[PDB]
Design an enzyme around this catalytic site. Sequence first.
Site, short mmCIF file in Angstrom:
data_model
loop_
_atom_site.label_atom_id
_atom_site.label_comp_id
_atom_site.label_asym_id
_atom_site.label_seq_id
_atom_site.Cartn_x
_atom_site.Cartn_y
_atom_site.Cartn_z
N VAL A 79 42.70 14.88 -30.15
CA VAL A 79 42.19 16.25 -30.08
C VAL A 79 42.17 16.77 -31.51
O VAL A 79 43.15 16.62 -32.24
CB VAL A 79 43.08 17.14 -29.18
CG1 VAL A 79 42.56 18.57 -29.12
CG2 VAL A 79 43.16 16.55 -27.78
N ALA A 80 41.06 17.38 -31.90
CA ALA A 80 40.92 17.90 -33.26
C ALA A 80 39.76 18.87 -33.35
O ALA A 80 38.74 18.69 -32.69
CB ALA A 80 40.73 16.77 -34.26
N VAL A 81 39.94 19.90 -34.17
CA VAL A 81 38.87 20.81 -34.55
C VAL A 81 38.83 20.82 -36.07
O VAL A 81 39.87 20.77 -36.73
CB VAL A 81 39.08 22.22 -33.97
CG1 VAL A 81 38.10 23.22 -34.58
CG2 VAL A 81 38.92 22.19 -32.46
N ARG A 88 36.87 29.75 -32.92
CA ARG A 88 35.49 29.78 -32.42
C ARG A 88 35.34 29.26 -30.97
O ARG A 88 34.23 28.98 -30.53
CB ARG A 88 34.63 28.94 -33.37
CG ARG A 88 33.20 29.41 -33.51
CD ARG A 88 33.05 30.51 -34.55
NE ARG A 88 33.47 30.07 -35.89
CZ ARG A 88 32.78 29.25 -36.68
NH1 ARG A 88 31.60 28.74 -36.31
NH2 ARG A 88 33.27 28.92 -37.87
N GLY A 89 36.45 29.14 -30.24
CA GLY A 89 36.44 28.69 -28.85
C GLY A 89 36.11 27.23 -28.55
O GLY A 89 35.86 26.89 -27.39
N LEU A 90 36.11 26.38 -29.57
CA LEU A 90 35.80 24.95 -29.40
C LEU A 90 36.84 24.19 -28.57
O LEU A 90 36.47 23.36 -27.74
CB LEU A 90 35.60 24.24 -30.75
CG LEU A 90 34.17 24.24 -31.30
CD1 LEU A 90 33.62 25.64 -31.48
CD2 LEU A 90 34.12 23.48 -32.62
N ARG A 92 39.15 25.48 -26.31
CA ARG A 92 39.06 25.98 -24.93
C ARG A 92 37.84 25.42 -24.20
O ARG A 92 37.92 25.12 -23.01
CB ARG A 92 39.04 27.52 -24.90
CG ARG A 92 39.15 28.10 -23.49
CD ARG A 92 39.39 29.60 -23.50
NE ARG A 92 40.76 29.95 -23.86
CZ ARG A 92 41.81 30.00 -23.03
NH1 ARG A 92 41.69 29.71 -21.73
NH2 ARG A 92 43.01 30.34 -23.51
N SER A 115 51.33 18.50 -30.80
CA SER A 115 51.47 18.65 -32.26
C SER A 115 52.22 19.93 -32.61
O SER A 115 52.99 19.96 -33.57
CB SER A 115 50.10 18.66 -32.93
OG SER A 115 49.28 19.69 -32.42
N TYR A 120 49.68 24.46 -25.86
CA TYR A 120 49.24 23.83 -24.61
C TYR A 120 49.76 24.44 -23.30
O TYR A 120 49.26 24.10 -22.22
CB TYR A 120 49.51 22.32 -24.68
CG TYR A 120 48.52 21.61 -25.57
CD1 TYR A 120 47.17 21.53 -25.21
CD2 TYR A 120 48.90 21.03 -26.79
CE1 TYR A 120 46.24 20.90 -26.01
CE2 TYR A 120 47.97 20.39 -27.60
CZ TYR A 120 46.64 20.32 -27.20
OH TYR A 120 45.70 19.69 -27.98
N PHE A 396 51.40 9.14 -27.85
CA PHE A 396 49.96 8.92 -27.86
C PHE A 396 49.24 10.23 -28.17
O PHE A 396 48.03 10.25 -28.35
CB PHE A 396 49.49 8.33 -26.53
CG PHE A 396 49.73 9.21 -25.33
CD1 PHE A 396 48.79 10.16 -24.94
CD2 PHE A 396 50.90 9.09 -24.58
CE1 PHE A 396 49.01 10.98 -23.84
CE2 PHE A 396 51.12 9.90 -23.48
CZ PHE A 396 50.18 10.85 -23.11
C1 CJ7 Z 1 46.15 7.93 -30.05
N1 CJ7 Z 1 44.91 7.42 -30.69
C2 CJ7 Z 1 43.69 7.32 -30.09
C3 CJ7 Z 1 43.17 7.61 -28.82
C4 CJ7 Z 1 41.82 7.37 -28.56
C5 CJ7 Z 1 40.97 6.84 -29.53
F1 CJ7 Z 1 39.68 6.62 -29.24
C6 CJ7 Z 1 41.48 6.54 -30.80
C7 CJ7 Z 1 42.82 6.80 -31.04
C8 CJ7 Z 1 43.60 6.58 -32.24
N2 CJ7 Z 1 43.21 6.09 -33.44
N3 CJ7 Z 1 44.20 5.99 -34.43
C9 CJ7 Z 1 45.48 6.39 -34.17
S1 CJ7 Z 1 46.66 6.27 -35.38
C10 CJ7 Z 1 48.11 7.12 -34.86
C11 CJ7 Z 1 48.97 6.25 -33.96
N4 CJ7 Z 1 50.09 7.10 -33.53
C12 CJ7 Z 1 50.10 7.34 -32.08
C13 CJ7 Z 1 51.05 8.50 -31.80
C14 CJ7 Z 1 52.45 8.22 -32.33
C15 CJ7 Z 1 52.47 7.66 -33.76
C16 CJ7 Z 1 51.40 6.59 -33.98
N5 CJ7 Z 1 45.82 6.88 -32.95
C17 CJ7 Z 1 44.89 6.98 -31.98
NA NA Z 2 39.04 26.37 -32.34
#
Ligand code: CJ7
Ligand code: NA
Length: 396
Positions: A79-81, A88-90, A92, A115, A120, A396
Amino acid sequence: VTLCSPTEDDWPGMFLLAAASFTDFIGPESATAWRTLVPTDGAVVVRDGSEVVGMALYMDLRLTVPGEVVLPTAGLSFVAVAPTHRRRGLLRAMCAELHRRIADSGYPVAALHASEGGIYGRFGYGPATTLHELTVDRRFARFHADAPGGGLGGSSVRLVRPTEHRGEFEAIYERWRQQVPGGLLRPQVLWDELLAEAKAAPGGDRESFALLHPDGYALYRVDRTDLKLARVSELRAVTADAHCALWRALIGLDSMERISIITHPQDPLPHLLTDTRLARTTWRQDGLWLRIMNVPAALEARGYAHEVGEFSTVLEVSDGGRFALKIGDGRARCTPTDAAAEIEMDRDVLGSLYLGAHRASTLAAANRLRTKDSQLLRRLDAAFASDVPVQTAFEF
Ligand SMILES: Cn1c2ccc(F)cc2c2nnc(SCCN3CCCCC3)nc21
Ligand code: NA
């Protein structure tokens, strides 16, 4: 500003966003491996108007809940913006689309690792496992007379290289995850990543070593900067003998001053020693967060405590329905009703209760669940409690 499922051409843009957003991001190779766990239509992107300015996805996971029941689980991640497109509501927009897809796909629960802690809750996620850093000053550490595997003769634990005993680790972990609430199936691609992290990095982490028992393993490395600290990255034990035997070996690291591990609140390690205080709790945080997608499916699938006698009640989730909840013989029945609610809570509160990590009385004391019946609270506490302690599988 449109929202859609990503095509193959969007993924380089997503990795750019990932590299700028996550400090633990490794690269395209690692990311492509994780991407195998994302199902078709499991990802969304926001383009400007062109470039990717937002992304979110879920992975297909298998979560163990109390009563050794395994649920299909939507594991939100990546998840990232963009910092250029904030407020900007992206998010949500992206989370609402993913939740619609997750609900329509038939997942009873969704899950994530947060994070930040204040984001959340409003999307229905509640913290459901607790992380616990223990730091042992091993120079003073002496095992109690009652501690298992403390007799004369040969030890059961072997010092080994991680890569050479992959199969044995997989088998032990697979046994562990099936019988512990919070356990997750770890696919082959994540074992590939784990073992890749175990090697020494040029100007990075040191080489990892393994302590192997028939019913348990521990993976550890010496800290990069502090050469008298050993960090246990992972420890999995199926029996108490294995758990104690591994810690005898870890306290046998006579080179080190301290041994650190991230574990759970019920870790029995403090009680293995003559001085319980030597196992200091240095850090404390929420682990896995849970959003119950379907209330009756989630509640009926889970196992409950046999100790509490049969009782009935009416639960309302704020915007998730009202239900007649009958619990007895370690099972629940959860049917629709318009009868007056006896218990009220938001969706996220139910997630925090679900695995048995948080007591209902504690959340009631914060007014996060309303009820005028204190006997009902005691019954909920006991029913939703888990006999096997709640643990965190992997991030994850
Ligand atoms: C968790 N995830 C993903 C989930 C879906 C995806 F299409 C790519 C990815 C993806 N790529 N690089 C990384 S590097 C960070 C690995 N970190 C997982 C959380 C604990 C610390 C290590 N993590 C990813
Ligand atoms: Na946003």
